[PDB]
Symmetry: C3
């Protein structure tokens, strides 16, 4: 293989590079020198490790294609990623839509996806809400509020926002009481087909630790609720829920084709399921998510349609190999 698969050494590089290896690619990890043993000693999946944030020149010399991990754009910056000369697997135009909460909402609405209600004016708050500070990833700064007046008290406490607006591009969103579900998709541009790869429940601290503390005991912890991502727990869904989850994925792809020149490769809809079986989506994560890391040896969904273990990392490598073999590699790269 002429093409090598390259990834930023974080988030899901082990899965991505093992999958590339399994498909006959030579593999490149780049990033901190601190994490190098992980990819070369403990799990020898990287044929090359480059101790640089973005080694453009060497990657071009190695015929690298970058498979973006879930923190690649974060560590490098969206300006650098969009001007990179090294080929990028997926559509770069998708990046602006997922960095803007209003563009996220516009995308979801067009794709006919159920979303929580949003309030521009805090005085209109009619039900418990979750407040999302601008540009926040990983749920940092998030806090809960019950009514218009509880919001102002906490807005001044956490964000310093004096009463009566000056709301620095925060999002005030209806808190939806449902169980967290994260379906992982893959859209094949080569096969013109959408697949369900797997599903997980993200494991977050301290939010998934507080239910172990009895109600009576919680006060003296002086608890602030945090949504720091720690890990992932494998799940399957109720089978009768699969069709609407998959259709939601189809509409998301179709909407992206009409808004941003398409969505292909891995993606995830992060949301909850309510007691009335509704899937309410908080965001479209148009990338490989950490949840796919469970399924190195395939998932309960891939094993229904494949004779071998297929992770999202392997599926990415499969797509790139098939694009090369079908003489259409440029079609999946931007």
């Amino acid at each position: 293989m002429k093409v090598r698969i390259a990834t930023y050494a974080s988030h899901s590089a082990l899965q991505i590079l093992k999958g590339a290896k399994d498909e006959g690619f030579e593999t490149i990890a780049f990033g901190s020198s601190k994490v190098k043993p992980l990819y070369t000693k403990y799990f020898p999946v990287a044929d090359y490790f480059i101790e640089e944030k973005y080694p453009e020149e060497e990657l071009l010399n190695l015929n690298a294609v970058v498979v973006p991990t879930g923190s690649f754009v974060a560590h490098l910056g969206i300006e650098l990623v969009e001007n990179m000369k090294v080929p990028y697997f997926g559509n770069k135009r998708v990046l602006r839509w997922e960095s803007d909460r209003n563009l996220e909402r516009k995308w979801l609405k067009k794709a006919g996806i159920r979303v929580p209600e949003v309030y521009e004016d805090p005085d209109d708050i009619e039900k418990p809400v979750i407040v999302k500070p601008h540009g926040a990833k990983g749920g940092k700064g998030y806090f809960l509020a019950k009514d218009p007046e509880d919001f102002w008290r906490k807005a001044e406490k956490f964000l310093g926002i004096k009463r009566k607006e000056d709301l620095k591009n925060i999002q005030i969103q209806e808190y939806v009481l449902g169980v967290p579900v994260y379906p992982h998709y893959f859209y094949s541009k080569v096969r013109e087909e959408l697949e369900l790869m797997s599903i997980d429940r993200r494991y977050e601290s301290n939010v998934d630790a507080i239910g172990r503390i009895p109600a009576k005991d919680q006060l003296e912890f002086d608890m602030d609720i945090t949504y720091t991502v720690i890990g992932n727990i494998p799940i399957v869904l109720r089978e009768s829920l699969l069709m609407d989850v998959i259709e939601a994925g189809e509409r998301v792809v179709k909407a992206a084709e009409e808004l941003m020149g398409g969505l292909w490769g891995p993606f995830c809809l992060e949301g909850v399921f309510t007691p009335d079986l509704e899937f309410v989506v908080f965001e479209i994560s148009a990338r490989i998510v950490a949840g796919t890391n469970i399924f190195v040896n395939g998932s309960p969904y891939t094993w229904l349609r494949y004779d071998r273990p297929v992770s999202t990392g392997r599926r990415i490598a499969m797509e790139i190999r098939e694009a090369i073999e079908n003489d259409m590699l440029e079609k999946v790269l931007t």
Copy 2:
């Protein structure tokens, strides 16, 4: 194979039909036109899709044997299923025992299984209870009550029961504080052997969502607790607990042989494990349960005794195949 394997297009049909494929059976899904793509496009495991609730005529023409799913008896009704001319994998006589809470309880008691205390008279309520509306499936309408007068308030609210009796065959049950555990079994009539297939913990909304909300913020939601089934999470048990769980299944099978002409094929005991390590069971589900859907690529338990992936779906197809090969297919069908 002469015999084709047919299932209702919901609940566990993907697993069942994939398992049948793996054992050399042609496959049939029947149900809603809405779900056809799931079984023919996204996961092509059904060689025939029939867009009818119960196409008896066509099923007989195709030499079908019906493997019952979770939704099958409910959608088609207990009487139709009882009188169906199409062969049914498992014992149909079991259905009347599981549709009645008094009969379930008698069956469990005879099998020496730990069950929660029940209350006929609401005045006798001394510890917290769970109230189960008549005929209710999937946790529909369940509510908690602390004492007699608190029961009466909520019974009027949720069920329209005026104070002082006329309890329309409602079940009032001791709430057992233990962790939900769902062992999945298979009894082979061909082998005369009980197997432990897998274990899961069912994932339910909003009940598994409320522990993410701090005590102080819970009252703002006006939470009615619900047990809508959303998905399934894989587990294993502490090893010293397996013998008790396996002996429980043996007694359940032995009790069914003396009561209802036997229990064979898949079943699940649904319950909790308390701090004193006791397995308290709420019901026997005498069918394939959704939790088995995790284990398409086998389970930590099947991989201890097989050299290949064995789901409950595949295990059924194995049983049917070996029955045909041992000229005893009629023994496993009613």
Copy 3:
């Protein structure tokens, strides 16, 4: 194979004996006659079952090497295990270091592992604490105290403690609010190398059941919080946390080399992950833990570096085999 692999019939014997089987060893289970069917009928993994707590003479005649399980030291007692003539996979000198919570902490400190604050004087309690009775196993007898006043009231109720003079070797430990995580390690003495085998979240009763009860309803239960081990749930971690977890294992092995003549074979670091991504460790479990039982068919981590399913049990058998073939069997046995 001359050498046979022997193990006490509990905790993780199924995984261990199946692992030995896969590596070409004849297998021995020893323990209660009550559990014999588990190991010989339901999962036929034991070539020999001996109905004795510790059958030294028979084990010597069968050329046995004992792979220690969870309850092995508990059942036999520390001194008998220290004086056994049958070879022991691992370092027996480790046993005193993990039986003593002071020596545990001395080991953790030398290994530069983050640990919770400990209180010798209950008047100094400024944050909520967990109280651990002397020598308590399986988290039993543990209770939460939220302040100095709450400690004395619960210490009197549960233990009969009235003042500082009679604290009777209880450990008062800062309650760390974080999600439970249990990484499973293997240090190969043959290959002089540390591996990450898998990770789980231990499933405990009633602590993991109480979050299903709404805060308003919790007081009616009069809850004693318990940490009784019931089962295990598979997880993966966030990728950027793996080096943290792996380096922690390295320092534990290194500190053991200076302190106790080394640590090889399976071990686990039991702890939590806080919102600021700290791995705070409660104890070193210097043995195979029950969380490994999920991964009979390998783990999301072993599948990154192996072409076949590798459990901790199999990995142990691999080590013993390779030690024999490299003529260094005596190096891994005490």
